[PDB]
């Protein structure tokens, strides 16, 4: 038993209004940063091998589309990225 | 005989006068599982990592995983009586052991309870089992001898006071024999001894102690035991408990020699603990931190400069440098040095002595392989006489083995080669030595002088053994003032070379092998 992107403020949103699909599929937020991999919540319209634009005119490639999140690999320096971007 | 039967009551009754009516406060948890010596505890919000946790009875556990919502801890003893819902109290304490001079001649477990049955301990208080070593600015360079009494080791592979020297080899090659002879020989050197037995069977520790007591060595020695029946936590801690006892002498300005028998059994106990705690297995299934286990242990063996001693003793002891010397033992499975635990310990130590089965079966005992053995302190550890004689020996003997391989089918030898192919056999024969028969410095020096200055050359090889025995016998009756001079001084001069030459000239003429 372990947590799978079950984090308090995301849960509180779903409590307030469950149908968050009302927000655009085009965008999302970083929820983890480690070793050059980021996990993103959202991006419902992401696709395999798509370029995701990051702050600082950087990019990541979407490589795992998972049921709750996208795993993407940073094509540059990563160490200044932060969750909630 | 036992008029104290009255007086033990007064001792018992005054305990009541000492005991204290204060209600204390403590942080509390409950056991939620018990398995294989590991317990999980709910609660203990104020538990610290490496803390002693106290259990029902007089039993303790060590807190190792501080996870969210549970503590994982290992029981230092028989665990099987514990149960779910038992109430568990966190002390403030780290693990400490009795320490002092009064430990000498006692057999104690890793917790330091006396198991010899010679009654309670005399001791000089308690010291932490886990402790940081002296830093760079607090050390002094190793430049004093600790004598093994073995011709092979003391000539070729000298050990200095504060060195760490790995004894490594396969099973049944004489690993322990070398280390207990190194203990036995300290009986009059002033160097205190510690023998830590990790994971051995208890009757082996009976036999060793019975040999140390058959000589005068046990009254110089502390014996620390964790037998194969005892829990993995007790075995894992047993080397650290031994080092804490050796550090008492080291911080006073006295010398101690500590033997860790089977550091590899300490690693196996540490692997048991780590897998039972579900920590991820690394290579060869050991945890990754296993290097930090051995390296923090062995860097405690150190020579400290006089300033560090004065500060520790608060000016009671001034001008004296203290030293702790460690002799760890590793077992290889088939000479394979590439295993994870051997490669770590070979990286850490200041050298190694390789003992190997082919030499031991050939009758070369002690089976020291001159080529792959090395001391990283070298000549700075020797007395000047041994330093002068022995430097030539070990590298010459290694090249003799290469030469003997290259020669093995060639019918014609040039006389440099033919001389080399003889001298090396006679030196190989000279370095064999019987167990429990240590030789003083002057006795070793005299026999090495006979080999370096060529006096062996005409003597037929099987007689070389009898030649040595007769030479030691001859010199002890007729020339003992020189033996006293060399043993006390370790000195070497032209008159020393002259007197030794005169002794070899006189022996080889007058006597018979």
């Amino acid at each position: 038993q372990l947590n799978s992107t079950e984090i308090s403020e995301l849960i509180k949103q779903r409590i307030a209004q469950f149908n968050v699909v009302s927000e655009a599929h085009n965008e999302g937020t970083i929820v983890s940063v480690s070793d050059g991999v980021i996990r993103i919540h959202g991006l419902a319209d992401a696709m395999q091998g798509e370029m995701i634009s990051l702050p600082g005119n950087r990019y990541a490639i979407a490589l795992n589309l998972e049921r709750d999140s996208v795993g993407a690999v940073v094509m540059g320096p990563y160490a200044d990225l932060a969750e909630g971007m | 005989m036992q008029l104290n039967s009255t007086e033990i009551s007064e001792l018992i009754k005054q305990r009541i006068a000492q005991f204290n009516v204060v209600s204390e406060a403590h942080n509390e948890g409950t056991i939620v599982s018990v398995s294989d010596g590991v317990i999980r505890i709910h609660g203990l919000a104020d538990a610290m990592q490496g803390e002693m946790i106290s259990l029902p009875g007089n039993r303790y556990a060590i807190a190792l995983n501080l996870e969210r919502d549970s503590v994982g801890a290992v029981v230092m003893g028989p665990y099987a009586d514990l149960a779910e819902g038992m109430k568990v109290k966190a002390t403030g304490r780290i693990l400490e052991v009795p320490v002092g001079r009064g430990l000498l001649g006692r057999v104690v477990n890793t917790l330091g309870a006396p198991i010899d049955g010679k009654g309670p301990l005399d001791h000089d208080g308690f010291s932490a089992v886990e402790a940081i070593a002296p830093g760079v600015i607090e050390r002094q360079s190793v430049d004093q001898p600790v004598q093994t009494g073995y011709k092979a080791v003391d000539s070729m592979i000298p050990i200095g006071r504060g060195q760490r020297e790995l004894i490594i080899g396969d099973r049944q090659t004489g690993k322990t024999a070398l280390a207990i002879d190194a203990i036995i020989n300290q009986r009059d050197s002033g160097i205190k001894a510690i023998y830590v037995a990790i994971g051995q069977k208890a009757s082996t520790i009976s036999n060793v102690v019975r040999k140390l007591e058959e000589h005068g060595a046990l009254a110089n020695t502390i014996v620390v035991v964790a037998t194969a029946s005892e829990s993995a936590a007790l075995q894992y801690l047993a080397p650290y408990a031994g080092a804490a006892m050796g550090e008492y002498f080291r911080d006073r300005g006295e010398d101690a020699l500590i033997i860790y028998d089977d550091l590899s059994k300490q690693a196996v106990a540490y692997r048991q603990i780590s897998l039972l705690l579900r920590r991820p297995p690394g290579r060869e299934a050991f945890p990754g931190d296993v290097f930090y286990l051995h390296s923090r242990l062995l860097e405690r063996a150190a020579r400290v400069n006089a300033e560090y001693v004065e500060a520790f003793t608060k000016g009671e002891v001034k001008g004296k440098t203290g030293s702790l010397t460690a002799l760890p033992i590793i077992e290889t499975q088939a000479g394979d040095v590439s295993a994870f635990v051997p490669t770590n310990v070979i990286s850490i130590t200041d050298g190694q002595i390789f003992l190997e089965t082919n030499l031991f079966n050939a009758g070369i005992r002690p089976a020291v392989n001159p080529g792959i053995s090395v001391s990283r302190v070298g000549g700075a550890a020797q007395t000047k006489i041994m330093k002068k004689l022995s430097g030539g020996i070990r590298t010459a003997l290694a090249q003799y083995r290469e030469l003997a391989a290259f020669s093995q089918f060639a019918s014609d030898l040039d006389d440099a080669t033919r001389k080399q192919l003889d001298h090396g056999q006679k030196v190989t024969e000279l370095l064999k030595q019987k167990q429990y028969a240590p030789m003083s410095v002057a006795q070793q020096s005299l026999v090495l002088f006979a080999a370096e200055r060529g006096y062996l050359a005409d003597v037929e090889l099987s007689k070389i053994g009898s030649f040595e025995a007769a030479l030691l016998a001859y010199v002890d009756r007729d020339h003992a003032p020189l033996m006293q001079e060399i043993n006390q001084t370790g000195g070497y001069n032209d008159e020393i070379e002259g007197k030794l030459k005169g002794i070899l000239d006189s022996f080889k003429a007058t006597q018979s092998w």
Binding site: - | Q2, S5, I8, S23, G117, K118, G119, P120
Partner: protein, 52 residues
């Protein structure tokens, strides 16, 4: 031989110490059971709450 004898004598005294202490507290328990008092019980409570 003399070291062996003195050591067994020292063990016998520590053994004898183990014997009395167990049966002493097991007796002192019965002194509570037959000498406890409700004013003394209240004295314990009122003392500790005054120094908690």
């Amino acid at each position: 031989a003399q070291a062996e004898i003195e050591a067994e004598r020292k063990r016998a005294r520590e053994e004898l110490r183990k014997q009395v202490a167990i049966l002493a507290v097991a007796g002192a328990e019965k002194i509570i059971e037959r000498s406890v008092d409700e004013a003394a019980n209240s004295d314990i409570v009122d003392k500790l709450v005054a120094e908690l």
